[PDB]
């Protein structure tokens, strides 16, 4: 497939990485009874670890000659790997940043601003917190309006 | 004249109304709005109880008044002619409260009108014989009234305990007074 | 704030203002307050008449062909299963011609509603005109050829209309549940009325 | 007229669909509020339209009048390429939206002496050739237009989400519920929201 | 005036003006007067829900301990659910809508005295007035109009209401910490204690709790 | 308690009452949605 690398749903090495990890935990689980506490953990981990492999095979990631899932970072077979998450960040980071902007400016005009950086006006911040939900629509409109730059 | 002699009545009860014997432990009659309503429910309630306890006895002077539910025009056929007739009548009484005079005039035969009258005591048509005189009657009315109201709950708890009606439950009491109480 | 001395539906209650006893059949019923804005009373007042006169016609169209067909005279069917497929033209056309002839008459009537004297004269035989009524919904002339001149009369119209409009709602309702003609519903009710209410049948 | 009676409406709505809703305070900038009002207006008109061609088809199909597919499966069909259809559409709309955009910038702008009687009216309400019948004292129409709009905007988001969840027609979803309302819900499916 | 801890004077922020004011806020929680206006409603509602709940158990439980029909309050949710037609998720969601509505309106009366009063609803203007933070009254909340009766008669009930409130809140939590420590109904916890009270205590099984 | 709340609204206290929140949130989401390399 892309860069000649196999899909994880098919690839042998990936499916032999399944086996090795599981068959590490089944060599442990022998040393305990089935009713016991740690046996429920070494079964639950296995169940989870065997579920995990299944859920990349269903996701359809590209696995190499290594047996490990590699990622795709440009265009549309593998959007969700990077292209979607990427926006996730720029949003929540932009959220944090713009809330922080609206806080510092909102304090600025109040005799001594430095006190509000330490004894933070919580009920100011928690109102700006929610306001900062719709930030790109404000951020754009502020770049337009021309209050964004000194 | 007081429910508990030597008491002082509550402030709101002044012996104006008929059968005001200074009784409102929970200042129910405290607000004039509510006390105007409660006046009516206490008339009508007794009027229905007097009418009903009068019935229970005289219908059994027989079979269980309680299982009379089981009696020529189907159930839903009869519940209709009640509903519309009762809805008709009850609304018109309820307008006389909504505004004290609003209804008195025969919508058909508007020639005939019910003369100006105190609430819940309508008269005109409804006082043909103009019998015994002035308030005193309204004080028999609420007295005889309450006694009838009480007796009914009696008649009910009397059914729901003995199985028999009123006159049989009494005949049972006479037979063994010492034995046939609630305390046995 | 509300007329005192005119027809009420809850005697003792309050007509609201906008129902002056001006329009025909005002006893001042508008619980939801749909006639508030006097623009919207103008429409509804007319809307009522149209809807009224279609019902009163229709309900006669419904009942009579049963009243006669049971006495036994010559074509008589069910007022819903009637329009199925049994006519000299097809469904399609009979609508087309219907929609055409109306679209004309209605835009004529509508202009008269919009402007009170706009359409009162023939535009072909232009000496022919219906008189200066000045009363949309009550246009007159041809439309009053035997010449009943009255307030009396304009009540009797909307009272019959309100009653007919229902009767038709009933016909929809009654058919949809029971599944026979409304004179057959009234027959079975009259045979044993008590054991045949709605509540019985529901 | 308030959206939450008691909540102090934000100052920047002094009653110029205004029920006082702007919690995040997008439209505090009156630049942004004029721009955002026509976003709404366009969003309403399209959606009222679009939904009419999801419901009125979808309702008549059960009625039996029209053998229409479901709105998910009306895309897929042979006549022309979709590339073409989108292109020709993207071409044709792009022209006209650009005539809206210059109106939003320079209201009158669409009446240059040089085929333009489509000058304007007020902002977001172009009228004239967009108003054949011509309707103009009762501008209550202006109100319903936003309201019937926000109702329809929600309705579509509903369609999109309620096929993602049950995978069946809105005219079906409407019945399934109406058949057993208390066992067929929001609450008896895939995802809790 | 009477106090929670006789001798120890009550803290300034308590006047003897509010119902059940026994100079008790040892932790200075309700000091700022707004933050106490908030707690006097929490306490009322808590106590009103607790009273309905305590009356709610105290009747089912005798109903189950009078005739073998009614279920124990603990395992009486599933018994309502399973036996009858209904589902859990929807109830829980229906509830949240109605309670959501009911609360969200009380919600905007705390911050705004006479807010919902404006008739902005179903034309019901005078029924959703302020009156007194914690007692809304009118034709709905106080139908009989003890609210609009007499000055003293109503003042005494505020007193009765908060006290019953505080006793039901205790009562309720016992029900909840008594099923826990002994796994039985509150008229099995009460019958066992009346027959042999000296032995059937916590001392037996119910530990420090 | 005007004073006690100002202290609770001090920088080091808020940071900690904020981080235990956005930490839990991320531990929590990794429980019911375990092991993500997509979404
Ligand atoms: C409005 C007053 C009213 C009252 C107080 C009662 C009271 C009663 N009805 Mg009656 N009914 C009343 C109106 C009517 N009932 C009936 C039709 C019936 C029927 C058909 C039955 C009763 C029965 C009963 C009894 C239910 C058993 C019970 O509660 O035991 C605790 C009870 C004595 C039942 C009965 O007979 O019980 C033995 C019964 O089956 N009622 C009609 C006509 C439709 C009424 C119309 O107003
Ligand atoms: C603007 C809104 C718009 C929306 C919401 C949709 C939505 C949809 N289109 Mg449509 N289209 C839209 C505009 C357009 N579509 C098309 C051309 C097509 C085609 C050719 C196809 C779709 C198909 C689809 C569906 C994709 C299947 C899916 O997501 O599974 C959940 C989906 C319901 C597909 C379909 O019908 O699959 C069943 C499909 O193949 N659309 C054109 C013309 C170029 C559009 C122009 O605006
Ligand atoms: C104050 C709130 C409240 C409390 C303390 C309880 C407590 C309880 N409910 Mg109840 N419920 C409450 C509110 C509500 N419940 C229900 C609907 C249900 C259902 C459907 C069920 C319970 C059940 C239970 C019990 C679960 C067993 C458990 O947790 O063992 C550890 C438990 C005693 C379950 C039960 O009875 O299990 C024994 C059960 O079947 N509750 C609704 C929705 C209307 C409520 C709304 O507020
Ligand atoms: C309200 C919070 C806030 C905001 C909105 C910004 C915004 C910005 N910072 Mg950051 N910054 C912050 C707090 C904030 N800073 C704090 C608390 C520190 C100290 C740890 C720094 C230390 C810092 C450095 C050292 C740099 C930035 C830089 C930047 C800019 C680029 C983005 C980046 O690298 O980060 C951007 C304008 C970079 C820049 O100027 O470009 C850069 O080099 N910041
Ligand atoms: C509102 C009061 C009330 C009501 C609801 C009823 C209801 C009833 N009475 Mg009546 N009854 C009443 C007052 C009332 N009674 C009074 C005031 C008297 C005279 C004191 C009687 C005397 C009476 C008799 C003698 C009989 C009934 C019977 C009945 C039943 C037959 C229905 C009928 O009469 O037709 C019905 C359940 C008949 C019955 O039960 O059968 C019957 O024989 N009643
Ligand atoms: C912007 C609104 C809008 C859009 C985008 C569409 C889009 C579509 N409609 Mg249409 N539809 C609309 C409004 C709209 N409709 C309205 C207002 C109605 C009338 C109430 C209908 C009634 C309708 C029918 C009856 C049919 C379509 C069909 C179609 C599809 C075929 C392509 C075409 O018509 O050429 C296409 C997905 C056809 C289809 O299903 O394919 C089809 O049979 N539509
Ligand atoms: C220099 C070359 C040039 C360029 C780059 C453009 C670009 C544009 N013109 Mg065009 N235009 C041009 C020459 C050009 N024009 C000339 C020479 C004339 C006179 C004949 C016009 C007359 C013209 C009209 C009348 C309109 C456009 C419009 C537009 C826009 C259409 C967008 C679209 O349909 O999607 C676009 C930005 C449309 C628009 O967006 O407005 C539009 O209505 N143009
Ligand atoms: C615009 C108004 C509107 C209307 C009238 C309806 C009506 C309906 N929706 Mg809903 N729905 C709507 C918006 C609307 N929806 C929106 C905006 C969303 C997005 C969150 C949803 C998401 C949604 C889901 C996920 C489901 C429904 C379902 C239903 C039906 C049962 C009630 C319910 O679960 O909710 C009912 C016919 C349920 C159904 O089909 O059963 C169902 O499962 N809807
Ligand atoms: C929901 C929506 C908008 C939601 C936004 C909200 C809530 C805004 C609210 C707020 O901003 C305020 C006011 C104030 C802020 O402080 C807070 C928030 C809360 C942020 C728009 C949907 C808008 C919905 C639209 C436009 C959809 C239109 C439908 C079309 C055209 C689809 C086409 C087809 O369906 C047909 C017609 C036929 C089918 O066969 C085929 C296809 C092709 C699928
Ligand atoms: C897509 C993609 C890609 C690419 C990318 C690129 C190529 C980019 C570029 C970019 C660029 C070229 C950029 C630029 C920029 C500029 C500027 C100039 C900036 C600015 C900024 C600002 C101004 C900010 C602000 C703010 C906000 C908004 C919020 C927060 C706060 C603050 C203040 C910070 C890749 C392949 C990787 C991956 C996949 C996808």
From TrEMBL, chain B:
Chain sites annotated for binding chlorophyll a 22: 173
Binding site for chlorophyll b 7: 92, 106
Binding site for chlorophyll a 1: 3, 42, 45, 73, 140, 144, 146, 173
Residues annotated as binding chlorophyll a 18: 123, 141
Binding site for chlorophyll a 4: 21-23, 42, 146
Residues binding chlorophyll a 25, per UniProt: 182
Binding site for chlorophyll b 2: 3, 23
Subcellular location: Plastid, Chloroplast thylakoid membrane
Annotated residues for binding of chlorophyll a 9: 45
Ligand binding (chlorophyll a 3): 3, 23
Binding site for chlorophyll a 17: 123, 141
Positions of chlorophyll a 5 binding: 21-23, 42, 146
Binding site for all-trans-violaxanthin 1: 24, 26, 59, 65
Record: residues binding all-trans-violaxanthin 2: 24, 26, 59, 65
A cellular component annotation (GO) from this entry: chloroplast thylakoid membrane
Annotated binding of chlorophyll b 3, by residue: 47, 92, 141
Annotated residues for binding of chlorophyll a 19: 140, 144
Residues annotated as binding chlorophyll a 11: 87
Residue positions binding chlorophyll b 6: 88, 106
Residues involved in chlorophyll a 21 binding: 143-144
Binding site for chlorophyll a 10: 47, 123, 141
Role according to the record: The light-harvesting complex (LHC) functions as a light receptor, it captures and delivers excitation energy to photosystems with which it is closely associated.
Name recorded for this polypeptide: Chlorophyll a-b binding protein, chloroplastic
Organism whose genome encodes this protein: Chlamydomonas reinhardtii (Chlamydomonas smithii)
Gene that specifies this protein: LhcI-5
Part of the full-length chain shown: 30 to 219 of 257
Automatic annotation (TrEMBL), chain C:
Positions contributing to chlorophyll b 6 binding: 108
Residue numbers binding chlorophyll a 16: 159-160
Residues the record lists as binding chlorophyll b 7: 104, 122
Residue numbers binding chlorophyll a 10: 122
A GO CC term attached to the entry: photosystem II
Amino-acid positions noted as binding chlorophyll a 23 in the UniProt annotation, renumbered to this chain: 198, 201
Binding residues for chlorophyll a 24: 202
Binding residue positions for chlorophyll b 5: 108
Residue numbers binding chlorophyll a 12: 140, 157
Residues that, per the record, bind chlorophyll a 7: 106, 109
Annotated binding of chlorophyll a 2, by residue: 9, 53
Residue spans crossing the bilayer: 54-75, 87-105
Principal location listed in the UniProt entry: plastid
Entry binding sites for chlorophyll b 3: 83-84, 98
Positions with a binding annotation for chlorophyll a 1: 9, 48, 156-157, 160, 174, 189
Residues the entry annotates as binding chlorophyll a 8: 108, 111
Binding site for chlorophyll a 21: 189, 197
Cited function: The light-harvesting complex (LHC) functions as a light receptor, it captures and delivers excitation energy to photosystems with which it is closely associated.
Protein name (Swiss-Prot/TrEMBL): Chlorophyll a-b binding protein, chloroplastic
Species name: Chlamydomonas reinhardtii (Chlamydomonas smithii)
Full-protein residues shown: 53 to 260 of 264
TrEMBL record, chain D:
Residues that bind chlorophyll a 17: 173, 186, 189
UniProt binding sites for chlorophyll a 3: 19-21
Binding site for chlorophyll b 1: 3, 45
Amino acids binding chlorophyll b 3: 76, 117
Chain residues that bind chlorophyll b 2: 45
GO-annotated molecular function: chlorophyll binding
Residues at which chlorophyll b 4 binds: 76, 89
Amino acids binding chlorophyll a 8: 97, 100
Residues annotated for all-trans-violaxanthin binding in this entry: 22, 24, 71
Positions annotated to bind chlorophyll a 2: 3, 21
Localization in the cell: Plastid, Chloroplast thylakoid membrane
Record-listed chlorophyll a 19 binding positions: 177, 185
Positions contributing to chlorophyll a 13 binding: 144, 148
Residues binding chlorophyll a 18, per UniProt: 177
Residues that coordinate or bind chlorophyll a 4: 18-21, 40, 150
Function: The light-harvesting complex (LHC) functions as a light receptor, it captures and delivers excitation energy to photosystems with which it is closely associated.
Full protein name: Chlorophyll a-b binding protein, chloroplastic
Organism: Chlamydomonas reinhardtii (Chlamydomonas smithii)
Gene label: LhcI-4
Automatic annotation (TrEMBL), chain E:
Residues involved in chlorophyll a 12 binding: 178, 202
Family: Belongs to the light-harvesting chlorophyll a/b-binding (LHC) protein family.
Record-listed chlorophyll a 7 binding positions: 103, 106
Binding annotation for chlorophyll a 10: 160, 164
GO CC terms: chloroplast thylakoid membrane; photosystem I; photosystem II
Residue numbers binding chlorophyll a 5: 46
Keywords per UniProt: Chlorophyll, Chloroplast, Chromophore, Photosynthesis, Photosystem I, Photosystem II, Plastid, Thylakoid
Taxonomic classification: Eukaryota, Viridiplantae, Chlorophyta, core chlorophytes, Chlorophyceae
Binding site for chlorophyll a 8: 137, 161
Protein name (Swiss-Prot/TrEMBL): Chlorophyll a-b binding protein, chloroplastic
Keyword Ribonucleoprotein attached: no
Chain positions recorded as chlorophyll a 13 binding sites: 193, 201
Positions that bind chlorophyll b 1: 4, 48
